[PDB]
């Protein structure tokens, strides 16, 4: 299984970016396997 990388761009901020998405505030826990889960 060949895993390989290809360059896709510079790391830059773009002044003309599409803007979208909410900003939810969530209670979460992070377990030993790196998995986030919701908490109540």
């Amino acid at each position: 299984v060949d895993m390989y990388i290809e360059r896709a761009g510079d790391i830059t901020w773009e002044k003309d970016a599409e803007v979208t998405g909410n900003s939810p505030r969530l209670d979460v826990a992070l377990d030993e396997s790196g998995d986030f889960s919701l908490v109540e």
Binding site: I5, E6, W13, V19, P24, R25, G34, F36
Partner: protein, 151 residues
């Protein structure tokens, strides 16, 4: 070895399994993308150097170099590199993961799995973390932590 954002590909045909960041000679991606396997870059090989399953992060060729953090107030940009698509910037105001150990920025953006490892940027262009470890809220909406390592 050039600074930049990179696709992580696997092989019949090829498939994009994720994305990563080259900075200061070190390649940064998420553990779940590569599981720590070595990577080919042209005719050269990149060997894993550090990784941690709980943080879901791995670095190649040297220690983790990215250390900028979300300022908690400002919009950020996901520099998404989806499979089959040109790198593109998506601007958003992060929400928050509140945890017993402190708060983590989170972006409520849902891109294909092969986008995991895409960098999230602050206004100065610094990588404040990587996209693709997160949680699902209601109606199948995914929310990604802004996952940053330690330099």
């Amino acid at each position: 070895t050039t600074d930049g954002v990179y696709r992580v590909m696997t092989r019949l045909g090829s498939t994009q399994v994720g994305v990563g960041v080259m900075q200061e000679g070190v390649f940064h991606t998420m553990w779940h993308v590569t599981k720590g396997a070595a990577l080919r870059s042209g005719e050269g090989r990149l060997d894993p150097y550090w990784g941690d399953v709980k943080q879901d992060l791995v670095s190649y060729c040297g220690p983790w170099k990215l250390d900028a953090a979300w300022d908690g107030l400002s919009e950020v940009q996901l520099l998404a590199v989806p499979p089959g698509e040109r790198a593109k910037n998506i601007q958003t105001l992060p929400g928050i993961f509140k945890t017993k150990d402190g708060d983590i920025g989170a972006v409520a953006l849902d891109y294909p799995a092969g986008t995991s490892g895409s960098p999230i940027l602050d206004k100065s262009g610094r990588v404040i973390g990587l996209y693709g470890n997160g949680v699902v809220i209601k109606n199948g909406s995914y929310v990604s932590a802004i996952t940053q390592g330690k330099r």
